Amino acid sequence: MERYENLFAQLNDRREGAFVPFVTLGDPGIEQSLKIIDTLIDAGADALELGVPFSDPLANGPTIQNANLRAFAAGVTPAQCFEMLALIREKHPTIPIGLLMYANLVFNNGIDAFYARCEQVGVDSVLVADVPVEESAPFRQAALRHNIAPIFICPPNADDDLLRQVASYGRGYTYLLIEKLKEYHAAPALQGFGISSPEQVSAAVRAGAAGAISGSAIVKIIEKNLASPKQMLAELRSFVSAMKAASRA
Amino acid sequence: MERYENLFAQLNDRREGAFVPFVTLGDPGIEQSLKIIDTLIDAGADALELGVPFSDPLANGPTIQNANLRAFAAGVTPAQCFEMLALIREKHPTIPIGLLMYANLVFNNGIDAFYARCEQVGVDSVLVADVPVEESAPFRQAALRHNIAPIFICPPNADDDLLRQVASYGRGYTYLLIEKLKEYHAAPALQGFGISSPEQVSAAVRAGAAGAISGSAIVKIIEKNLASPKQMLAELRSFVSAMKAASRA
Amino acid sequence: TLLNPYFGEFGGMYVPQILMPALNQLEEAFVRAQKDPEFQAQFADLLKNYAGRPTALTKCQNITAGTRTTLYLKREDLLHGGAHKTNQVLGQALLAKRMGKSEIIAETGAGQHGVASALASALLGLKCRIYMGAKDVERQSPNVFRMRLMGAEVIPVHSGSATLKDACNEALRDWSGSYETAHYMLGTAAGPHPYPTIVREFQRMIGEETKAQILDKEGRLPDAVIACVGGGSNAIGMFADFINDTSVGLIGVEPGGHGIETGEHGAPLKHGRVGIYFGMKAPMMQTADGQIEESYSISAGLDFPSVGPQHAYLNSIGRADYVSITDDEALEAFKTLCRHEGIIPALESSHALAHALKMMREQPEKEQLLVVNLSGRGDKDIFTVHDIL
Amino acid sequence: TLLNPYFGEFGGMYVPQILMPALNQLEEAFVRAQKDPEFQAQFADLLKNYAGRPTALTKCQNITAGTRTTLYLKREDLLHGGAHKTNQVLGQALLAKRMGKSEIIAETGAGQHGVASALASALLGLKCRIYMGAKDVERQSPNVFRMRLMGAEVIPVHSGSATLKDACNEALRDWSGSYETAHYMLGTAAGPHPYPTIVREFQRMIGEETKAQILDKEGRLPDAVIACVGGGSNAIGMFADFINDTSVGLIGVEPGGHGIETGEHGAPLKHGRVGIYFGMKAPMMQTADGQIEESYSISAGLDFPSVGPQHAYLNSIGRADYVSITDDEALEAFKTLCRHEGIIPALESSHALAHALKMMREQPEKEQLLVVNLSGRGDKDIFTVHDIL
Numbered sequence A, B: 001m002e003r004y005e006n007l008f009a010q011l012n013d014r015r016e017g018a019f020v021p022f023v024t025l026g027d028p029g030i031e032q033s034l035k036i037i038d039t040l041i042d043a044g045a046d047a048l049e050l051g052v053p054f055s056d057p058l059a060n061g062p063t064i065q066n067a068n069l070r071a072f073a074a075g076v077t078p079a080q081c082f083e084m085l086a087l088i089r090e091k092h093p094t095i096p097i098g099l100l101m102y103a104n105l106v107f108n109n110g111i112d113a114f115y116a117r118c119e120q121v122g123v124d125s126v127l128v129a130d131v132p133v134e135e136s137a138p139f140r141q142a143a144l145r146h147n148i149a150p151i152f153i154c155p156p157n158a159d160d161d162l163l164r165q166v167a168s169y170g171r172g173y174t175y176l177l178i179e180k181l182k183e184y185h186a187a188p189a190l191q192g193f194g195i196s197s198p199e200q201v202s203a204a205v206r207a208g209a210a211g212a213i214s215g216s217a218i219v220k221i222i223e224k225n226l227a228s229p230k231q232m233l234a235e236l237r238s239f240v241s242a243m244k245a246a247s248r249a
Numbered sequence C, D: 001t002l003l004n005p006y007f008g009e010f011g012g013m014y015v016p017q018i019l020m021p022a023l024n025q026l027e028e029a030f031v032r033a034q035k036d037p038e039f040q041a042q043f044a045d046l047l048k049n050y051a052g053r054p055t056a057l058t059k060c061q062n063i064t065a066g067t068r069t070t071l072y073l074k075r076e077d078l079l080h081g082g083a084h085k086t087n088q089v090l091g092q093a094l095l096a097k098r099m100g101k102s103e104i105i106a107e108t109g110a111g112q113h114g115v116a117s118a119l120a121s122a123l124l125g126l127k128c129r130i131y132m133g134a135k136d137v138e139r140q141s142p143n144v145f146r147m148r149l150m151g152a153e154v155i156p157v158h159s160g161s162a163t164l165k166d167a168c169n170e171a172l173r174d175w176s177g178s179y180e181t182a183h184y185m186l187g188t189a190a191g192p193h194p195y196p197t198i199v200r201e202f203q204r205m206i207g208e209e210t211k212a213q214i215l216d217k218e219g220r221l222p223d224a225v226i227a228c229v230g231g232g233s234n235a236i237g238m239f240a241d242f243i244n245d246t247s248v249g250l251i252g253v254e255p256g257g258h259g260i261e262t263g264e265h266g267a268p269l270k271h272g273r274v275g276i277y278f279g280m281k282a283p284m285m286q287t288a289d290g291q292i293e294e295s296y297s298i299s300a301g302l303d304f305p306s307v308g309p310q311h312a313y314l315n316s317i318g319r320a321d322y323v324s325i326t327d328d329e330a331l332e333a334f335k336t337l338c339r340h341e342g343i344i345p346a347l348e349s350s351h352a353l354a355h356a357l358k359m360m361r362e363q364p365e366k367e368q369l370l371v372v373n374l375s376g377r378g379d380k381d382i383f384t385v386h387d388i389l
């Protein structure tokens, strides 16, 4: 909850937009993943969206699904992900950290217990990809009790009732209309439709969104430079600083 | 017709029974077959029962069916069989010659024409294995018109009506009750149930039959000594003289 | 005999004397059975509750779209076993039981008849032994296993000759001595009387249902009923009830194989000559000097060298018409039915459909109500077609 | 929603927001359809004249001889396609047409659902694309060809994951953007609402016919109805009409695989724990930390890692009872049915029969009227059993 307010407020004073990169925890390896994350952070990432390898990525296409395969090949477990999250939080106190989850890994050993573990490690928000607003009640109530921001996706085929729900239920940011969202006082919208070029970040901000999220683009770079860990980071740094520059004023 | 009367009359004066061996024309080869036949004749055979290789031997078991295979492998045709029959008749004027036929080779180019060809080569009788007394009319009428004796099989499951029919329809000999057959004045009965030992020939005669027919036994010897043509004939001679001796008084 | 063994000049009982008692025994039992309401009720119960009759009559609109032809398919492919064979095999089985017999003797090629004999015997507590030739076995391995699973004793015959007509010899030889306690189960409307008659009567429900169903759907009889002709059972089953309906065309379709002119076909009725074999006088595939030849067809179920006596007769008097369909034409009808109606027809039935498609396509503006007897399913043929495609 | 998405605690619609409109669209159409007499008449015509309903209810006397058990088999193996799958695939296809859709999207494992989607689409003029994983394809090659023959577009998916649940991801992803013109055809009574409800309603004729047929034959309802449970469609189809008949036992049979204790099984309802996946909250095969596991069974048609929501619910309240049957027990029931009744059951249905045989054999003097849902034929399994034997 807290960290998002602080970030968007600061970005606002700077007439700057937020750039949030997505990455799969443990891809291509745990050690390699921590390095990637630090590089993203210190390259200009305003927030982070991290996914934990799930056996059945429903709302995922090619690039992202392959990332999970790589994480699983490395034997990455949810337990190891939360250990990584604690370390990342220990190194970076203010950067908002969001999790992309699938309902089962949240529900597995108790929904509330999951959110407690999130708060304990310093996670700020959780977007459960396969839970529509119609089934979000126990997830959002638990997130709230633990000071976690429940993130909701606002699809292109969204209607008024949905807009109103996402507005009252969501916290932190709205995973993306823009004018209606602000009308209902929704959390700052962050566009996530295949954002892969600097021109797309500036366009997102210009349209009234508070920022943009780029996932596959980041994953591509990793998938592209597996055999060259150093070139992977180097290219990841260049990509991020370019995307961040495009949100800046 | 004629030759059978002459043979049975003579055998009668000698209180002797008839021994008729069966062989497939052209088995194991045409040249080899003519030799086998002459050996059977001059060994003591009183009559001969010859079969022409038919593609589908219905009323035939293992031994006989294999004989046809051998004849066919040698390319024996019905045409070649009738040529053999003429030669055999040219060498032996009095020995009765019977044919074991299957309806199709008789019916093929005209039933009557078949019987005419039989008379022309000097055949004395024809037993069409797959024609019961119920379907014999055109076959027997044609055989008669051409002085050929129509042979009928009298099965063990035969009843009175059949006994009476076989008696009035058959000529030459009755392929086998014995007392009933003589009552109806049937043609001299010749038993053909697996006759393979001298003891069986004497037993057949003692029971009142005019003789015995042995087929598979002869074929066995041929099938047994294929690689040794001379030993084949030698053994065929010994078998025949033994069987013939057993009918003698 | 109690019934006429001949259909004009065709038919008869050309078997060795020893087998006549078995034939006369069977004819007598069949006659009693047909008069017996209890036998009919038992036969009916089985067909209904065990085999799944009445089978449906499917109107195929997609394939006849844009033409004046209305096509219906008699769904024999939906019968227990996937082929029309079951009907008469069940009837013959009840008949053997009526005669107090405990064994069933059969022979096979395509495997379908062996499997059918096996299902009926297993169901009715009969000991079944099936003769099959080595060459034929290896090819029909799936059906061989099916027969064994059903308790049938598949007896391997191999002595030069190893095909249907060649294996029949051993089946008959057995029956010659076992007929007191065993019944030879012939799989088609052929062979010596009373088989051509029994098989037709035990398959005639196909035609009787079709008539009722066509009257229900269209309120009129069809212009023509079309059926493939291997030995003639499915065809005569369909034809039988329509014979006295002179306005209804009866079309039998024989396998043209690689094409009539190539000689590699299985269409004796129209491209062979009368002979005597299989215990009957009928048109057959034979050499100039009387030696029986083998039929050819992409579909093994139509590789019978001869045809039923009643078909040869129906043709002579001009009551039924017979035509031929090539492997290629049959393959096309097969693929067309799959894609347009979602029905995988047996390669055998595909010859009958292929002809119906020809009648339609050659004269698109001709109004005609057709019924094709879809005698079986083609699940068994997917590999064959697969290899050709 | 218009209907309750939950069966107690089980069910729901756990799908990404983007897919909710497609689900609500389908639920609305289903509701209209059910109220529409014309839709019901069209659906009925197809089931009757195309698929072959009503299927028979076979009394199996031979297998229950010497015991007080009377066994009847609901003949779904005689349905067009050889499996109960056709019923609901036809219904869903008419539903897509009601919604003005032209495409059908599906995914497969055992191949049966892909083939079923293909037959319905071909029949009703729908463009069908089927997702299948490489590993799964090579194994189900015959069904792959069948689908292609029926015009279906079998799309080869291969990216590490190559199984049903793994291929569903691409099928759903597609539907996310194509739902305006395409309908995702789910093959079992599972997944997000309204699928568990739609599939049951489109399979309930099995139970409605069984009730009428049992009343006709025995003049009483059965003591128990038994059905194998892969995802739950054939089972719920049989159960549905008997739920309010409290005297009728409902027994669902899950695959025990190599034996429950070995872990290599496919029985999540009784030996798994509630989770959230496949768009539903239901018992499933999963690791201690929430990762979904694979089910195991000699029969591929029962390798679903979860179970329908309504089954998990029927169990919780004690209305239906669920048990497990090992591969070995299923193989024995398979062979026993072949030899004693001449019926080749699918390895899937063999689990349901194997249990009925157990109920009988353990208590031979217990009088009980049983009905086993013979959901499909085992022609497809002869090779599998062949290799084991």
Ligand SMILES: O=P(O)(O)OC[C@@H](O)[C@@H](O)c1c[nH]c2ccccc12
Pocket (backbone or CB within 6 Å): A022, A049, A051, A059, A060, A064, A100, A129, A192, A193, A194, A195, A196, A213, A214, A215, A216, A217, D016
């Ligand atoms: O790859 P994209 O088009 O740049 O968008 C990021 C996306 O992959 C990431 O946020 C994400 C991972 N899994 C998801 C599941 C649902 C929605 C979004 C996601």
Ligand SMILES: O=P(O)(O)OC[C@@H](O)[C@@H](O)c1c[nH]c2ccccc12
Pocket (backbone or CB within 6 Å): B022, B049, B051, B059, B060, B064, B100, B129, B192, B193, B194, B195, B196, B213, B214, B215, B216, B217, C016
């Ligand atoms: O082989 P046997 O049992 O000794 O009988 C001679 C027999 O083979 C011969 O006469 C014959 C050949 N083919 C037949 C057909 C039917 C009756 C008899 C035959």
Ligand SMILES: *Cc1c(COP(=O)(O)O)cnc(C)c1O
Pocket (backbone or CB within 6 Å): C082, C083, C084, C085, C112, C113, C187, C188, C189, C228, C229, C230, C231, C232, C233, C234, C235, C301, C302, C346, C348, C349, C375, C376, C377
């Ligand atoms: C056995 C078979 C036939 C061929 O034989 P008929 O005796 O002519 O009927 C036709 N169709 C199918 C599907 C078969 O299995």
Ligand SMILES: *Cc1c(COP(=O)(O)O)cnc(C)c1O
Pocket (backbone or CB within 6 Å): D082, D083, D084, D085, D112, D113, D187, D188, D189, D228, D229, D230, D231, D232, D233, D234, D235, D301, D302, D346, D348, D349, D375, D376, D377
């Ligand atoms: C698909 C299949 C099943 C398993 O699934 P359900 O959804 O449980 O019904 C059962 N039997 C057969 C024969 C099948 O093909």
Ligand SMILES: [K+]
Pocket (backbone or CB within 6 Å): C229, C230, C231, C266, C267, C268, C295, C302, C303, C304, C305, C306, C307
């Ligand atoms: K033929």
Ligand SMILES: [K+]
Pocket (backbone or CB within 6 Å): D229, D230, D231, D266, D267, D268, D295, D302, D303, D304, D305, D306, D307
């Ligand atoms: K399951």
